Amino acid sequence: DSFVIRGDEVRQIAPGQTGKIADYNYKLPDDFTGCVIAWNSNNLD
Amino acid sequence: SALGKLQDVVNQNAQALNTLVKQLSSNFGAISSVLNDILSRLDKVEAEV
């Protein structure tokens, strides 16, 4: 999966989370078997 | 007191079942033994743990 979010939102990209991204945009399963990879892109985006 | 054996077998079973009921109230280190007051209070990962 690939997307961009503001730096405040990144904690929502995890299993079992609550918040507007987790509820209404993008959600990971309770048995999510994977890795989350992220970086700031302020010199690019 | 002559009939004590039979009365004691009733007493022991009542005492065992009452102990098994009273143990529903014990917390075992969880925030409360009222099961809905874990679920209604915590986030799902914390509630499951």
* Number of A–B residue contacts, CB under 8 Å: 6
Mutate to test the interface with A, among B39, B42, B44, B48 (most CBs of A within 10 A): B44
Query: Experimental method for this entry?
Result: cryo-EM
- The tokens describing B33, both together, are 């033994």
Distance (Å, whole) CA B20 – CA A8? 49
B20: enclosing H helix or E strand: helix B4-22
Q: Structure resolution in Å?
A: 3.5
Q: DSSP states of chain A as a string?
A: ------GGGGGGSSTT--SHHHHHT----TT--S-------TTT-
- The tokens describing B1, both together, are 């007191």
